[PDB]
Amino acid sequence: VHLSAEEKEAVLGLWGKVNVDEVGGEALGRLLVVYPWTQRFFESFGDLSNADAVMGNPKVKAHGKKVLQSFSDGLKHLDNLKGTFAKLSELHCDQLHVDPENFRLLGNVIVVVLARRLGHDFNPDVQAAFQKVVAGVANALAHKYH
Amino acid sequence: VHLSAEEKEAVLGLWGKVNVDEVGGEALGRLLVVYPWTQRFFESFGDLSNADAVMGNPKVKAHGKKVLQSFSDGLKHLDNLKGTFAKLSELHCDQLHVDPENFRLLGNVIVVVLARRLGHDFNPDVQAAFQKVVAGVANALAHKYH
Amino acid sequence: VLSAADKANVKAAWGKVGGQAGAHGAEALERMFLGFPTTKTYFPHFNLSHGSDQVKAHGQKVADALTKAVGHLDDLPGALSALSDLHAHKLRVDPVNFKLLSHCLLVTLAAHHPDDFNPSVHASLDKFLANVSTVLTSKYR
Amino acid sequence: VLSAADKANVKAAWGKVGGQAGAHGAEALERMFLGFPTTKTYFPHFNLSHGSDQVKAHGQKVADALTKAVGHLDDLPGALSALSDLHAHKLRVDPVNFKLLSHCLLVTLAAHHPDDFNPSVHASLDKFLANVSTVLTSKYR
Numbered sequence: 001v002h003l004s005a006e007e008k009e010a011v012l013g014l015w016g017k018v019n020v021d022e023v024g025g026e027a028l029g030r031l032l033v034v035y036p037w038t039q040r041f042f043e044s045f046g047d048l049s050n051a052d053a054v055m056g057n058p059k060v061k062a063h064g065k066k067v068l069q070s071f072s073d074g075l076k077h078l079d080n081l082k083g084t085f086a087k088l089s090e091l092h093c094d095q096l097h098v099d100p101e102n103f104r105l106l107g108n109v110i111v112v113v114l115a116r117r118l119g120h121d122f123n124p125d126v127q128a129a130f131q132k133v134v135a136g137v138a139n140a141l142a143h144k145y146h
Numbered sequence: 147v148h149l150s151a152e153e154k155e156a157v158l159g160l161w162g163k164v165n166v167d168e169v170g171g172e173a174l175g176r177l178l179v180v181y182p183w184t185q186r187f188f189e190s191f192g193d194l195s196n197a198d199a200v201m202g203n204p205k206v207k208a209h210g211k212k213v214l215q216s217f218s219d220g221l222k223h224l225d226n227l228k229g230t231f232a233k234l235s236e237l238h239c240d241q242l243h244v245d246p247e248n249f250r251l252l253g254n255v256i257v258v259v260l261a262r263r264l265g266h267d268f269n270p271d272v273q274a275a276f277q278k279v280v281a282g283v284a285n286a287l288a289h290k291y292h
Numbered sequence: 293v294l295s296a297a298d299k300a301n302v303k304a305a306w307g308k309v310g311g312q313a314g315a316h317g318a319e320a321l322e323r324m325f326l327g328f329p330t331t332k333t334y335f336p337h338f339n340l341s342h343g344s345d346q347v348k349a350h351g352q353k354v355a356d357a358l359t360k361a362v363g364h365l366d367d368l369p370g371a372l373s374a375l376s377d378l379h380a381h382k383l384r385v386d387p388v389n390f391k392l393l394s395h396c397l398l399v400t401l402a403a404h405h406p407d408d409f410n411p412s413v414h415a416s417l418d419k420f421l422a423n424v425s426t427v428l429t430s431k432y433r
Numbered sequence: 434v435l436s437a438a439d440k441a442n443v444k445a446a447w448g449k450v451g452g453q454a455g456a457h458g459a460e461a462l463e464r465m466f467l468g469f470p471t472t473k474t475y476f477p478h479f480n481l482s483h484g485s486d487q488v489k490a491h492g493q494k495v496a497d498a499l500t501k502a503v504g505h506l507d508d509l510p511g512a513l514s515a516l517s518d519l520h521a522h523k524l525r526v527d528p529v530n531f532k533l534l535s536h537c538l539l540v541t542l543a544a545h546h547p548d549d550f551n552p553s554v555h556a557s558l559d560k561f562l563a564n565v566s567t568v569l570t571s572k573y574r
């Protein structure tokens with residue numbers, strides 16, 4: 001996408017104060033409890049019938065950390081998010097068969113967790129800067145499709 | 147868009163059978179009818195308050211053909227949709243403020259129209275090739291957004 | 293929240309389809325598996341090339357399911373009783389796949405009934421399906 | 434659908450919000466106008482700045498519709514007739530804007546009360562706002 005020259009700092013700045021590790025485990029876990037139908041892609045993760053079990057399950061954390069790691073090792077490469085998620089979308093389309101609607105759902109989920117985290121410092125203007133980024137990933141990942 | 151040699155011959159094989167004057171007016175008319183909220187961006191186009199008033203509204207038919215004429219030109223350049231649709235994007239983005247979602251609804255209403263009028267000549271396969279293109283036009287117009 | 297109109301158009305349009313309904317359930321699924329391949333993964337045990345006895349059999353079960361809803365317009369939740377639980381908490385069907393199966397069911401009807409598929413009927417059938425969708429995806433929670 | 438757990442999760446979460454309801458109804462709107470400009474058209478008459486009598490006057494009101502719903506979860510339709518006909522007829526407020534206003538209200542509640550907001554209250558509050566939305570997106574005709 002096209003963030004400005006000020007929005008570039010709003011994001012880059014607070015990505016440095018968010019423990020992407022925990023966030024990654026909270027976004028993925030928060031998704032699965034909120035959007036139940038996605039548990040179908042993680043059935044080899046064990047049990048996910050109760051909110052607690054899911055937000056405890058060590059697998060979700062280990063993977064969450066992976067989700068947010070690429071989110072970050074993708075940040076800064078903004079103007080070409082299409083070249084950063086290539087194989088990564090191939091994998092999603094051909095291998096996983098995920099529907100891109102779900103990428104907009106996750107970007108939204110992560111975006112709320114962050115709020116729970118930086119609290120008061122996650123002012124409206126920062127939300128609007130992340131809002132465009134998460135759309136950029138969300139649409140980059142939906143690239144190699146049909 | 148990623149259109150294979152066969153997929154491509156099918157789509158273009160199909161536009162030659164489409165009467166643009168006719169199609170463009172029934173699609174945009176059905177849009178204003180099936181999804182009421184859409185009428186707003188228009189309003190000025192006169193008395194809209196029944197299938198008959200929108201179908202019969204002259205202006206709905208004219209605009210409906212410019213729309214298709216664009217979809218036509220766009221088709222003539224599947225290889226570089228974004229470029230083609232650039233100018234039209236900040237027209238719907240800045241000028242119009244149309245949620246990019248409506249671009250796919252319209253696309254998906256044009257498909258229901260190609261079918262109502264091409265019947266058997268709109269076999270499952272051809273429609274599939276065409277569903278691609280629709281995404282392409284939607285993602286294309288949803289480019290220069292802000 | 294179906295106006296009295298939609299209840300009539302839906303009953304007529306479906307009613308005019310008559311016998312053909314089954315054939316439509318199937319056509320609607322091919323047009324889906326090929327238009328939105330992401331949806332084929334719920335049917336790996338099936339063979340879905342074209343007019344194969346399997347899609348043909350599932351398709352009739354699909355049309356019959358709508359024939360009941362069309363006939364129980366007032367109480368849709370009960371009418372579907374188990375199709376919803378069998379969709380939400382079990383196969384765990386993503387909700388977009390309902391959206392794609394409605395437009396490909398609609399497109400079928402148009403290809404076969406351009407005669408009686410006026411804009412009004414089109415709008416009413418669209419609601420009927422969005423309605424049938426919330427139901428199948430309501431027991432998500 | 435809002436089940437008993439959902440009903441008691443909302444009430445027990447909204448109850449906590451208390452008097453801030455107004456400041457949080459407004460923040461959300463304000464977050465919406467910024468995060469999604471395409472919604473700013475629905476208000477060419479407000480002073481749409483970081484708070485001007487308008488956004489908080491409006492927020493204050495949005496905060497009350499919800500409190501009404503939150504107090505009538507059992508039967509929202511009746512207790513939401515007006516607004517539904519104000520958004521699905523008079524104003525033709527495009528359906529997908531309720532999706533972007535809910536989000537922001539979730540990002541607002543979550544930034545201010547990060548300790549009641551557990552995964553269940555979240556899941557539960559994503560269904561209130563969903564079924565309130567659907568309600569305000571019936572009237573359409």
Ligand code: HEM
Nearest residue numbers: 038041042066067070071091096098102103106107137141
């Ligand atoms: C917001 C965008 C998302 C990002 C950045 C993301 C990224 C990733 C990454 C980093 C991997 C690495 C796998 C590899 O290459 O070996 C992965 C795997 C995977 N993703 Fe995502 N993902 C996203 C959204 C989703 C969503 C929402 C779903 C499904 C509902 C999903 C389901 C999966 C699954 C099942 C795997 C493989 C897990 C396994 O087999 O162990 N992803 N994803």
Ligand code: HEM
Nearest residue numbers: 184187188212213216217234237242244248249252283287
């Ligand atoms: C296939 C995608 C679309 C294409 C090809 C397209 C193209 C066109 C063209 C050529 C114009 C003239 C623009 C001008 O100079 O004012 C137009 C205007 C407009 N379009 Fe579309 N459009 C698309 C989809 C839609 C959708 C989904 C909406 C939603 C309601 C929309 C709303 C409008 C409005 C408000 C106008 C201006 C009214 C007027 O000029 O009288 N368009 N469109």
Ligand code: HEM
Nearest residue numbers: 331334335350353354357358375383385389390393424428
């Ligand atoms: C909205 C219309 C739909 C209706 C009314 C409906 C109805 C049906 C019917 C009648 C069956 C046969 C159940 C039985 O064994 O008795 C069924 C099962 C199932 N449905 Fe649907 N369904 C709908 C949409 C979908 C969607 C969107 C998907 C695809 C993504 C889907 C995937 C399946 C699968 C895999 C099964 C069972 C496989 C089998 O045992 O034959 N259905 N559905």
Ligand code: HEM
Nearest residue numbers: 472475476494495498499516519524526530531534565569
């Ligand atoms: C959580 C769901 C929503 C609730 C409950 C809500 C509530 C309200 C209320 C209470 C009013 C004021 C009625 C009065 O003055 O007596 C109203 C009007 C209005 N709403 Fe919403 N609203 C919602 C979503 C939206 C959305 C998403 C939009 C579009 C962005 C929107 C746009 C407006 C506009 C255009 C008015 C005009 C009111 C005026 O000019 O004073 N509302 N809404």
